[PDB]
Symmetry: C4
Subunit: 354 residues, 4 copies
Amino acid sequence: AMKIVKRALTFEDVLLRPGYSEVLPKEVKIHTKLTKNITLNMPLISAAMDTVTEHRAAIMMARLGGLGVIHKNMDIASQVREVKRVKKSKEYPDANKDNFGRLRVGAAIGVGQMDRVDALVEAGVDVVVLDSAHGHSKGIIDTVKAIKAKYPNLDLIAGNIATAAAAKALCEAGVDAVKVGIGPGSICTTRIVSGVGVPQISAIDECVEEANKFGVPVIADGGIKYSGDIAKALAVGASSVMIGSLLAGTDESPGELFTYQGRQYKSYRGMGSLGAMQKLVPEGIEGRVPYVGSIRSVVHQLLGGLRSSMGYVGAKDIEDFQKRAEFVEITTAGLKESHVHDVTITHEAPNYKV
Amino acid sequence: AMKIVKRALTFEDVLLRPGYSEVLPKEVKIHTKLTKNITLNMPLISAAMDTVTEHRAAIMMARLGGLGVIHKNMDIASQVREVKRVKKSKEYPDANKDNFGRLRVGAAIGVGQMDRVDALVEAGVDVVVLDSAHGHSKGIIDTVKAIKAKYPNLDLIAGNIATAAAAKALCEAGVDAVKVGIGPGSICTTRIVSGVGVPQISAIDECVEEANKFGVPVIADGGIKYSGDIAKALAVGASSVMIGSLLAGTDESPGELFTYQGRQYKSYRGMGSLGAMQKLVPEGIEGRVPYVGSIRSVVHQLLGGLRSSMGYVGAKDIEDFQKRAEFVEITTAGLKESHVHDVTITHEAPNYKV
Amino acid sequence: AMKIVKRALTFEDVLLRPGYSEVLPKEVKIHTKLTKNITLNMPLISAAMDTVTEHRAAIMMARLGGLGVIHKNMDIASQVREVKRVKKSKEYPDANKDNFGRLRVGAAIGVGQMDRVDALVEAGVDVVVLDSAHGHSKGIIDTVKAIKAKYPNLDLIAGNIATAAAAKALCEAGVDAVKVGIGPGSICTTRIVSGVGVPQISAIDECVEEANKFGVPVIADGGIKYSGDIAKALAVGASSVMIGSLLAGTDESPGELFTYQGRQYKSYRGMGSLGAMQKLVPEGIEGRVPYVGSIRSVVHQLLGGLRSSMGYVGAKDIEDFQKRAEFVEITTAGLKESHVHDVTITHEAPNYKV
Amino acid sequence: AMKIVKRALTFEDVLLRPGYSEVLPKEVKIHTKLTKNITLNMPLISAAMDTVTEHRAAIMMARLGGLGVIHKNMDIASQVREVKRVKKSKEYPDANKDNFGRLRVGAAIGVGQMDRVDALVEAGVDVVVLDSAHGHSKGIIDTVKAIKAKYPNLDLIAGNIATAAAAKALCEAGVDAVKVGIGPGSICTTRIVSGVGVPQISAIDECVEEANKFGVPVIADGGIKYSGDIAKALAVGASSVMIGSLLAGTDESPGELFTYQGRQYKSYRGMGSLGAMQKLVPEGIEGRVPYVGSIRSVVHQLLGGLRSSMGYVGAKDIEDFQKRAEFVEITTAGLKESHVHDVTITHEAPNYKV
Ligand SMILES: C=C(C)c1cccc(C(C)(C)NC(=O)Nc2ccc(Br)cc2)c1
Ligand SMILES: C=C(C)c1cccc(C(C)(C)NC(=O)Nc2ccc(Br)cc2)c1
Ligand SMILES: C=C(C)c1cccc(C(C)(C)NC(=O)Nc2ccc(Br)cc2)c1
Ligand SMILES: C=C(C)c1cccc(C(C)(C)NC(=O)Nc2ccc(Br)cc2)c1
Ligand SMILES: O=c1[nH]cnc2c1ncn2[C@@H]1O[C@H](COP(=O)(O)O)[C@@H](O)[C@H]1O
Ligand SMILES: O=c1[nH]cnc2c1ncn2[C@@H]1O[C@H](COP(=O)(O)O)[C@@H](O)[C@H]1O
Ligand SMILES: O=c1[nH]cnc2c1ncn2[C@@H]1O[C@H](COP(=O)(O)O)[C@@H](O)[C@H]1O
Ligand SMILES: O=c1[nH]cnc2c1ncn2[C@@H]1O[C@H](COP(=O)(O)O)[C@@H](O)[C@H]1O
Ligand SMILES: [K+]
Ligand SMILES: [K+]
Ligand SMILES: [K+]
Ligand SMILES: [K+]
């Protein structure tokens, strides 16, 4: 007999039940925690990818109350430059600011890049995001120990993990948040290339339960296709959500729009695709996503879905949302009924593309 | 661990078992209850949408023994006008009439629109349909209390809900029927935009069980794709069914037919689509449905399927249908076997479009 | 709570396990029982449809050791004529013959058509097939009683049923076989139009268990897409299988081949389609199936699959096949792995069309 | 009631959980056992098919540390010739060699072909692969007995089986490895034609458990679509994997590339297809697969996925991989999330084609 630990679910497998509500969606509060010490005025973080976040995206993210993580596929001096650009930036009331009244920013690092870390810290970065394919490893854990030993009060996010044991090891090493998601990313092939991963909803749930013991927030990273998924991710216990594909088609993301066969697009590619890495064995693809206009407008629709959700559940804030949330498991047939069905769409909605 | 209340099913997940029958389908009775006090000679209600029901559709609906609900996306004086048109309308033996021998009609209202309610009541409307995205809310419940306090004998339908607790709160507030369906509508994106909803078959079953305690009928609204679904909905305990997409392509629905690429259509759109509401965060889309001719002919095929169903089950009437009904859960493979399979359709059937 | 009797499976949901075998497929015996008194040299029956079986198909069926049922969508005098043509027909060693050494034939009848029955009996028909949408009804059961009372030794098949209770009622009325299948037919829309049916594998299993108590064979009718399905149907306990779509494209079936867009076809339609019945509420469609050549060649491939199957299981004959058979339930993913996958077919196989 | 032994899973139904890792993928060891006495420096075997393995493919396979099995669809003298070509062949450090320092090779045989066996043995073949549609049969078992009685120290692989009982019978007869897979092959139609088979992951698991009692390795043959599947197969307990479709499009496989509609391909067909066998009842199809270049490069990507996998699990070698492995069952929705989703691929990856 093979050891099957459980049957794991992801977003399309569950729904939230409506509950008694005394709140309208414009009234709910959506402030949350990025780390033990850093709060967000809204729970969205743009992914640390070279087709998603550099200074322009990071600036808008923080202006809107979230955060951008500057990717690390560039040399130390450039990444420092990108950070300083964000730091040096009534129209944006919910802006997410540091002590100097400057916009907050995150910056990605890898294993054993203490040089990069020194430079980013001196440049005034708010949080360092230590990302790896496998956060549950000696390499990553040694790096956390080295960083916290050298910078005891630097906010450090570490990822990516998918199990409770992984969350424990990272929290015990002293991280300020853990990032969850092995393989759910739109451009990610890890689960297919290696056969390894945990469906995202189950992964978040397992990791939150363990991380809560340390009061360490969980970041749910990857696999968000719609606003409803953000709601579900937050409802199950994640404190924030990290998004790549939904933000890659924006004005502010790196790169320019192009038109192919009468549609507008931008490139979007995984950091583990051959393209991004330049024989290599990739765990990501290079692709394109539809052009969707301003980051502002995209975030507005996403947050509106979250607001709507909390309204349906009766939650006044994210914490209240998490305690009230009840899920129902659905079937393939229920997924179809949930989507648009038996009607051809003639005017596309801003928040639902089929 | 995440709190999963249950695994919920919708229509495509179940079938009715055939049982011993002494009745032919032309002999079964299909009279039912719309509310505590209002009966239907057949269990179909046309949806309160600006692409489905105005006076023409409402008139035909009631003539055929059902009801139409005039939508509320128009000013008070127009909606009053639409109601009066229905009231002022041997060829139609099963017609559904009031005390004056006039056709019955429903008219939709929202939260805190008592002005609209006064006007509709004075115009002689038979039932007011208080619709909201979230019927299980203080807003809706306060409105019910205010309406029943002012008009103790006005038949009031309230919706939409999807849980037993929601049904209890509404029944205790004094409603005459509850309307069930969060997210199953063909043009509805609520479940995707907010992540909230309950698969329709499970939702009806849960709400009926609670509503029965008060002798309050349940209206199953949305997600009907075929005549079989109506049968299933009634069999599980709903007293009537509300239909949008299947009636939107009729002569009688508002709007005109147009031809696109050699097919005939009519527009059909959700009331929560951007189009219908005129930044906004929609929960519906704008679309088109095939043109299907007269309301008469469509209803004939639908009711024929219901009749056939009750025959197979051996039910002499809807009440008997509900007590005899036994379901079987099926699989994806069983759904395929159920549909047409392994043959290409060359002459389309009136009651089955693939 | 809704009364769900069980979770029902159909063919694509199961596989047979291989077992220890001392037999090759050319050595297994495939004789079986059509009814209590009539045996087949092979277990296939062609459906009683006006696009499948008239004299030519029936003749070939019996020559090959099976049976054809002449459809009843024609007047009494014509159907009598078709029967007499079969009766009046070393090249066909396994031929299925009566007392006169004439080919056996079946002929369909409906409720209260005793006139048709007298005429068919006098014409020398071997078995009368009383078919109805709902075999579990007073109409059908009264007809069985009337026929067995008048013709105590006439072999009577009655259908169609899908439950154990239905099988009991028919067996107690004195039928010689029961026919199983509500809604699995390729051209059938009953499950969608009325919401009523039982997935075919579960239906056979339930009915066999009850019918065995009376020593009454079960005929599994409808839903056969491939040779493997025949094997599964027989393995679960059915004594024979009735086939429409797989035989409709043959030389011998009524009608001529035509070519459309470079492919050859024949018409195939349900008896409850509008076309076949000539307002009406159909439970079938009119369609087309690929032209597949001779009945001989089609049956050869089908029987070869059965032979192969019994080989894999180690069965020396159908009875032995039924006692040895063990199933495994599979998943959607297992179904994909089972089919051809990840390769494009360039030369089509005679026994597998994708 | 029908006897359902279990619900069986295949590859797409499971994932491996990540665990704590102190190893990088370039450090894990991938040596394994082909049989009791023959080791591989890497766990891949090319299928014994006339579109996959003759001398050129076999030579490269062994050079890379695996093995090729020369197919038997040719006369004895030719197959002997192919074997001698392999035997007569620092650039290939991991090469898989015999006592003479010559490349190892396998050669396929059928039931009662002792003549072929004598010739292959005298030609110096390293392992004889006795393949049959049904390894669990008197024919196959008698052949094993005859071969081991005549050649007690000749390494004999026998297949194909799918049950624990089949594994027991073969191990007790004295085989050196068993080969597992009834019906999962890309070009295989056995499960559809006969209704018989076991989903590959369940089949391996069941057979390994029994074979381990004898210290007999299990070869998982067929159904491998991606590198992740190899990992999963090894993780569940198989000692090696046999591959057809993934190697059929290589330079080294028999046949030439051709271009059709702007894509490059090679033919790939089952040994039980009509084409390969030349009325016959096939259990395979003739098809085409994309041209993928050198065997070297394909194997590199496959092994890279395995290495990556073991890294994620923390396994230092295959044996350690097997003891650490924990699976999670996923849903259809989880499979979608696992694949690339919601992005159009613009530059294809070498190790992931959609
Ligand atoms: C986010 C992922 C998966 C990512 C990002 C960048 C590069 C990569 C590559 C190099 C393709 N894969 C990669 O680094 N995989 C890996 C697997 C297991 C262990 Br232990 C360590 C590393 C992967
Ligand atoms: C039927 C629905 C969902 C509908 C109909 C019209 C408009 C809308 C819009 C405005 C898009 N959505 C809407 O009113 N949503 C909503 C969600 C939760 C709570 Br609490 C209150 C309202 C929704
Ligand atoms: C095999 C079927 C379903 C069939 C064949 C011919 C005609 C029909 C039609 C007339 C369309 N349907 C039909 O006879 N349906 C039916 C349903 C319940 C009861 Br009780 C009695 C009859 C159905
Ligand atoms: C690998 C398979 C299935 C294969 C390979 C070559 C030929 C065949 C053919 C001849 C089509 N099938 C075949 O030999 N089937 C078979 C089934 C049961 C028993 Br017991 C014995 C044999 C099958
Ligand atoms: O190439 C890669 N392989 C695997 N995961 C990746 C790769 N590149 C980015 N990711 C992850 O995928 C996330 C984005 O997923 P998305 O929001 O679903 O598009 C990022 O935040 C990373 O965690
Ligand atoms: O835009 C909207 N969002 C969500 N539900 C809607 C919207 N508009 C109409 N509905 C519901 O959908 C039902 C029609 O669903 P249908 O019969 O499946 O097409 C209506 O009766 C309403 O209850
Ligand atoms: O129109 C109809 N409605 C429902 N079932 C039908 C109809 N016509 C034929 N059938 C059934 O379908 C069977 C053929 O199914 P097939 O072998 O899957 O194509 C016949 O033997 C009948 O039992
Ligand atoms: O025609 C056949 N019928 C059934 N299985 C076959 C046939 N030919 C080859 N196989 C099996 O399929 C395997 C290849 O499967 P693949 O790796 O999925 O393409 C071979 O190693 C054989 O075990
Ligand atoms: K919907
Ligand atoms: K069907
Ligand atoms: K297959
Ligand atoms: K993915």
